[PDB]
RNA sequence: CCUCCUAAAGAGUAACGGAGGAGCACGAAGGUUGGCUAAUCCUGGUCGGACAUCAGGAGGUUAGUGCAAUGGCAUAAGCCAGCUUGACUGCGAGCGUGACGGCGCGAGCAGGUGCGAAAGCAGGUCAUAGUGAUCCGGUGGUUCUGAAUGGAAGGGCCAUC
RNA sequence: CCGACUUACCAACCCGAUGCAAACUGCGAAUACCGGAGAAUGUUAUCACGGGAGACACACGGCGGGUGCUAACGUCCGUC
RNA sequence: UGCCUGGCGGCCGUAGCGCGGUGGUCCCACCUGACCCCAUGCCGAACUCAGAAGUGAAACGCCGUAGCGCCGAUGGUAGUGUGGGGUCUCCCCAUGCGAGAGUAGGGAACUGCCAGGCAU
RNA sequence: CGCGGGGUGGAGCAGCCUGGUAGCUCGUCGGGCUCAUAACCCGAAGAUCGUCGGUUCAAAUCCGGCCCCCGCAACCA
RNA sequence: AGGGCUACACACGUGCUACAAUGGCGCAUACAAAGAGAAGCGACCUCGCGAGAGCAAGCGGACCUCAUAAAGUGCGUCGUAGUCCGGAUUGGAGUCUGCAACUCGACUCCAUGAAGUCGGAAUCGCUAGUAAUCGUGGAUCAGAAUGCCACGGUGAAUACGU
């Protein structure tokens, strides 16, 4: 026990647990044997439409001509 | 050391009984975790040596023993007695405390690496985890001039064989790579 | 000048016989105390090939050894860290040794020193290589002489170029 | 492109056998060599230091071996 | 006297190695804790310190074992002093010396010292 | 000997006493000129100023020594 | 059908944007011409940082709309510092046109942010509404202009001499 190197080692008390008791581990798939996608969720929202426009409250049944608005 | 308290209190009896062993140091007992880290030589001005020092620094607060190129022969070349890899044979009870994150939920770091298999530890129960990416202590900054990849972690074992090896490393918990 | 053999189991041995090297390096690469053990291949591996590092195993000295070769070694002689400067002066029992010049080796004595609790050790480097007779001149020391006397030169003696 | 179901195909480590060595040894005589104790014989041979040297140009021959063509009334050494 | 551990030995591969089996307060290891001496080119793993329980497992004694290593007869055999011959750097013959390897076979060790436990 | 003097981008030359800046020419590699080629012109590239060390905002330069050359030195019983 | 036409190392011709303090930065503020538009251009409306989004008048063109000219001016502002220029690049989010934006689009936006500090030798255009500069509009066009064509602001130096 040489008393003169090694300055920290333990001071948080090693809290990690799930996501929630300081930092993360999550699921039983906590072996993380792949990279980072950086591109999935929420754009892929669980659904396959990649940003249709601003919300209407009409949303009619069929077809249109945009520059006539009839 | 709570991983090693877990082993004292819970795992030693689990393992003893299930494998039918007759004496406490006949039973499995996890020994002396050690590391390496191999640098791409030290560089002409010993800068990849500095890079050994901060990466060690990441998971041991010490200094390196610092291993030397004893023979130097083929293509990395020269000097045949200059510093190379970064070994720590860690402290005891404290090293087992380190073992509380030191290859348990070391997982948010991991991206895969060539070790940690419940088939390709050696035919002597000795194994080497080359981790790549540093564990994280929680203090300020994350500009370390980083050396991106480091740290073969060579766990040593009261183990001579295949059966004591997978007693450890697998179902002692933490799990091996799935 | 050094190492092997010829060289015939003491050893000296000859040839434009056979085969290699030296003409220093040394302020620690010396001393002492304290500690420590290789080559090599394999099993696994962050990138290096398992063939730069790591752990384990097998191996058991085949490595190391400043510089050829031969002998050597694990008390290491080798590898390392402290303190340290016995790389000591005066001598030297007895000897191997060479025609001689001369070379080598050495317990102890006496002094003064360093390490070591200490017994103990060390008068260089693990050994054999790393050199040059006398003359003359040169600098330094000397309680030696210093031609009538006193001093001086000069010369002697000792240290060294 | 990894790797292996897949050996059909190669030569290393290894294994068994076999041979060789001036500069190879995990082995080793004969003899020669040193010193010691005793017997015998030996006109003390020997051994010290003094006077006087000649000598240092040796060859064939047996025995051992370098060179040579296991040539030379060769050559060089050892032994006799 | 006996059995057993340990220190110090004698002798120093017939003594070693592998292989297989056995033993724990008598002692010995591992062994836990390192506060304090002291110590790690970093590391209480080592060195060092404080020490029970655990445990004979690993180590180490012990016991069995020839696979191995090893020793190893007897005979013959090469070589050789000397002496004699044929001739060639080649042997025979005289008489002395006489190997190395292999064979039969031996072989997992005998032995002094003080201490400690146990048997008595 | 002692003295003096030299030690420049591949190559050959500039800067030198108070110093200030690595210049020039060939050779390079691309451009320009002319309808095209030739040469001509041009841009860029290409250095520790032989070495170490002392100073100022300034050392290529001035100073010692190192390391390296060269001229003279009628010097070594 | 999918790639390719569009690669990229490099050299060359053209246009772009700037290197600033006449300037760049903010607000406020003024006056253009010429055009194009039915399966098109498309206000006002309400959302949206923005592009746009959606609702829908209107237009059939000196009527509506694309469409608010902009530089210039007026005041504040920066103070020569590769910046408060320039903003290419590059990450992420976003709008959009359309079978389909990945090779290979256009556009918004947020963050970050390089070279460029007037440019060898050489070299081109220019005499008057011209040069210089600011912006506008359209044809090709599903979408997709830095270019082409035309439009108008502000508006010059000078040619002594052959």
CSV table of C-alpha atoms in Angstrom, one decimal, chain A residues 8-51:
chain,number,residue,atom,x,y,z
A,8,UNK,CA,-8.7,9.3,-7.1
A,9,UNK,CA,-10.3,5.9,-7.6
A,10,UNK,CA,-13.8,5.5,-6.2
A,11,UNK,CA,-15.3,8.9,-5.1
A,12,UNK,CA,-18.9,8.7,-6.6
A,13,UNK,CA,-19.0,5.2,-4.8
A,14,UNK,CA,-19.6,3.6,-8.2
A,15,UNK,CA,-23.3,4.6,-8.6
A,16,UNK,CA,-24.2,3.2,-12.1
A,17,UNK,CA,-27.2,1.0,-12.1
A,18,UNK,CA,-30.0,1.4,-14.8
A,19,UNK,CA,-30.3,4.8,-16.7
A,20,UNK,CA,-31.4,6.6,-13.5
A,21,UNK,CA,-29.0,6.3,-10.7
A,22,UNK,CA,-26.3,8.4,-12.3
A,23,UNK,CA,-25.2,7.7,-15.9
A,24,UNK,CA,-26.7,4.7,-18.0
A,25,UNK,CA,-26.9,1.1,-18.4
A,26,UNK,CA,-30.1,-0.1,-19.9
A,27,UNK,CA,-31.9,-3.5,-20.7
A,28,UNK,CA,-30.4,-7.1,-20.9
A,29,UNK,CA,-28.8,-6.0,-24.2
A,30,UNK,CA,-26.2,-4.1,-22.1
A,31,UNK,CA,-23.3,-5.7,-24.0
A,32,UNK,CA,-23.1,-2.9,-26.7
A,33,UNK,CA,-21.4,-4.9,-29.5
A,34,UNK,CA,-22.1,-2.3,-32.2
A,35,UNK,CA,-21.4,1.3,-33.2
A,36,UNK,CA,-23.7,4.5,-33.2
A,37,UNK,CA,-26.4,5.0,-36.0
A,38,UNK,CA,-26.7,8.9,-35.2
A,39,UNK,CA,-29.7,9.1,-37.6
A,40,UNK,CA,-32.6,6.9,-36.2
A,41,UNK,CA,-35.4,8.3,-34.0
A,42,UNK,CA,-37.4,10.6,-34.1
A,43,UNK,CA,-37.2,11.3,-37.9
A,44,UNK,CA,-37.9,7.6,-38.2
A,45,UNK,CA,-40.6,8.1,-35.6
A,46,UNK,CA,-41.7,4.5,-35.5
A,47,UNK,CA,-43.1,5.4,-38.9
A,48,UNK,CA,-41.8,5.5,-42.5
A,49,UNK,CA,-43.0,9.1,-43.7
A,50,UNK,CA,-39.9,11.4,-43.5
A,51,UNK,CA,-41.6,14.9,-42.8
